[PDB]
């Protein structure tokens, strides 16, 4: 469907204004060597599976959490986040590091509150877990390397054709007619030597970072028109992590995608998922359809989905959509601690299983557009592949590519 996108400000949520006065920001960054062994503390109640480059807000209340934060503010400001595969047994084999970039303590109303904004950095595999006497647990971890490869043609590339492997006036004039001509010329030239192998050009084109990024850009523009090629990073690694961070998936599939080492495989998986899963149903019911990707749109600068923090220190990987259905509203609309300034939220439950799905944002002013939208929590949704296909060949939820 084709609704409105004008009037609001996509930069309001990215700032997370709901956390209050401007925090004490830090700019000194840290990154360890690849395959290096490091001992890092773990946050307990972080039931979120972090992605490198993903923003994460937190409101901590427990005294131990506040003490660990105080100790880290002077040091490297880095901690770990476990990827809980089985939340019941607290099992985690992988995880992601997180660096604090904004901080503010508050002893107001007779309660030790601490507000923090952090960002993802590096992936890692768990080696060992220890627990100190003070409750805070440590983790002996191995940094996972980012495996990057040269172009498929590098090995077969003929020496005579090495020259002019570079294209004249590198970029296209943004237009996709000039760009279709450009992509065809690009494929004929870059993958010419493909004739020397067992496969054709169009196959290799599927494993080229540039082509994959362009197709992903074409899918992204479909969600929001306020996109410029500048906004997105050019580095395929950072690009892939950014794309993955705002794709609504279940935990198992998120774990699987994080396990990927090469950016090429990550991008392939992302495109595959974007094409496959056209439905989004209730995670608990599995049969109750909630929405489709046609209704997806980016209400923030990062993307359609992002992690936000609530008044009680719970994180929600919430997704912004135009339309939803099969939902009963609980309570009355409120602006209390709203993530999208100028809108009031209303709790939404599944009319069948009565499981929380998200909230209904309603505009406070009449001039605002859109007047209403939906924010669905990722933990409560399930991406579903379309059935049909003559119904002689069915399937099951699985990550292809």
């Amino acid at each position: 469907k084709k609704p409105n996108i004008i009037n609001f400000d996509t930069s309001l949520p990215t700032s997370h204004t709901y956390l209050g006065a401007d925090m004490e920001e830090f700019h000194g960054r840290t990154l360890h060597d690849d395959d290096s062994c490091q001992v890092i503390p773990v946050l307990p109640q972080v039931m979120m599976i972090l992605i490198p480059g993903q923003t994460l807000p937190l409101q901590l209340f427990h005294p131990q959490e506040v003490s660990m934060v105080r100790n880290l503010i002077q040091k490297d400001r880095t901690f770990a986040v476990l990827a809980y595969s089985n939340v019941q047994e607290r099992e985690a084999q992988f995880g992601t590091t997180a660096e604090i970039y904004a901080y503010r303590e508050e002893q107001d109303f007779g309660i030790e509150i601490v507000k923090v904004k952090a960002i993802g950095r590096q992936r890692f595999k768990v080696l060992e877990l220890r627990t100190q006497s003070d409750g805070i647990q440590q983790a002996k971890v191995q940094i996972l390397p980012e495996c990057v490869l040269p172009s498929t043609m590098s090995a077969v590339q003929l020496e005579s054709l090495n020259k002019c492997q570079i294209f004249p006036s590198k970029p296209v004039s943004r237009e996709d007619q000039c760009s279709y001509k450009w992509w065809q010329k690009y494929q004929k030239r870059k993958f010419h030597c493909a004739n020397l192998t067992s496969w054709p050009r169009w196959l290799y084109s599927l494993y080229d970072a540039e082509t994959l990024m362009d197709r992903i850009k074409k899918q992204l523009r479909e969600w929001d028109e306020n996109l410029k090629d500048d906004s997105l990073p050019s580095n395929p690694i950072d690009f892939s992590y950014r794309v993955a961070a705002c794709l609504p998936i279940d935990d198992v599939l998120r774990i699987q995608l994080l396990k990927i080492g090469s950016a090429i495989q990550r991008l392939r998986c992302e495109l595959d998922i974007m094409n496959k899963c056209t439905s989004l149903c209730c995670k608990q019911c599995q049969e109750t359809e909630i929405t489709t990707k046609n209704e997806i749109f980016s209400l923030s600068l990062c993307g359609p989905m992002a992690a936000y923090v609530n008044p009680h220190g719970y994180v929600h990987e919430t997704l912004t959509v135009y339309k939803a259905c099969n939902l009963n509203l609980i309570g009355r609309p409120s602006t209390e601690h709203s993530w999208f300034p100028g809108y009031a939220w209303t709790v939404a439950q599944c009319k069948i299983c009565a499981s929380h799905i998200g909230w209904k944002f309603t505009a406070t002013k009449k001039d605002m557009s859109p007047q209403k939208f939906w924010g669905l929590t990722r933990s409560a949704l399930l991406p579903t592949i379309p059935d049909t296909e003559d119904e002689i060949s069915p399937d099951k939820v699985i990550l292809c590519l």
Binding site: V87, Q88, Q284, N310, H312, Y314, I330, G331, S334, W345, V347, Q349, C353, A354, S355, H356, W359, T377
Partner: peptide, 30 residues
């Protein structure tokens, strides 16, 4: 007097005591 009860996970407002205890059971269940 006894103002409404709400859930800390999602803000789900309710009335009678154990109703919210039922609602909260549906979050961290799986």
């Amino acid at each position: 007097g006894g103002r409404p009860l709400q859930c800390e996970i999602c803000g789900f407002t309710c009335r009678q005591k154990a109703s919210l205890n039922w609602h909260q059971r549906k979050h961290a269940e799986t």
